[PDB]
C-alpha cells in the first residue's frame, strides 16, 4: 500500500538523526518501514 | 644473581593519548568507573552481560 | 617463592618452599558476516555497466 522509500534522495541527506534506538521496537510510528540484511537488490 | 633484569622492563613505552574516562578514588586506589552499555550494546540486541 | 619466619622449638623446623607452575592457553574465535547481493556484485565487477 505505502510508497517505497526513495533511495536516490537519501544519498544527499538533509540532516542526521541524533538518537540511537532499535527502530523496530515501535513500528506503528512509520508508514513505510523496511529492515534489510547486509545488502539487497532493491537498493540497486 | 638472585635478582635479574626483568625481560619486560627492557621495552620502551608505547605512545599514549588523552582519553576521557571517569577516574574514581576508592580507598587508596584509582579505578576506571565505567558502564559500557552505551558505547557498546546500544541498538544491538545482544543483552548486557 | 614463599618466605620463612624462623620459629622456636618445639615447633617442627620449617624449610624454604618453592612453587613451580604452568598454564595452558585457552583458544577462541569471533565472527561476523558481510553478505552482499547479486546485482551489487554485477555492478562492482563492471558487468551490468
- Phi, psi dihedral angles at B39 (to 5 degrees): -50, -50
How far apart CA A31 and CA A27 sit, in angstroms, is 9
Closest CA to C41 of A43, B43, A18: A43
**Quick one: which of A7, A10, A9, A2 has its CA closest to A41?**
A7
Cell readout for A29 is 510510528
DSSP state of B9: G
Using an 8 Å CB-CB cutoff, list residues of chain A that contact chain B: 20-22
C16 in Cβ contact with C5 (< 8 Å): no
Alpha carbons A27 and A34: distance in angstroms, whole number: 10
| Of residues C33, C37, C43, nearest to A40 (C-beta) | C37
Structure-determination technique = cryo-EM
- For residues A22 and B43, the answer to whether their CB atoms sit within 8 Å is yes
Distance from CA of A5 to the nearest CA of B (A): 22
Nearest CA in chain C to A39: C36
Resolution (A): 3.8
Amino acid at each position: 500500500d505505502p510508497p517505497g522509500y526513495r533511495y536516490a534522495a537519501a544519498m544527499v541527506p538533509t540532516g542526521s538523526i541524533l538518537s540511537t534506538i532499535e527502530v523496530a521496537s515501535h513500528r506503528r510510528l512509520f508508514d513505510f518501514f523496511a529492515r534489510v540484511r547486509s545488502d539487497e537488490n532493491s537498493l540497486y | 644473581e638472585a635478582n635479574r633484569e626483568t625481560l619486560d622492563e627492557l621495552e620502551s613505552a608505547p605512545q599514549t593519548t588523552r582519553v576521557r574516562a571517569d577516574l574514581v578514588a576508592i580507598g587508596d586506589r584509582l579505578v576506571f568507573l565505567e558502564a559500557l552499555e552505551k558505547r557498546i550494546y546500544a541498538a544491538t540486541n545482544v543483552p548486557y552481560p | 617463592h614463599q618466605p620463612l619466619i624462623a620459629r622456636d622449638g618445639p615447633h617442627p623446623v620449617e624449610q624454604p618452599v618453592h612453587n613451580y607452575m604452568t598454564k595452558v592457553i585457552d583458544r577462541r574465535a569471533l565472527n561476523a558476516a558481510f553478505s552482499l547481493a547479486t546485482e551489487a556484485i554485477a555492478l562492482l565487477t563492471g558487468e551490468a555497466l
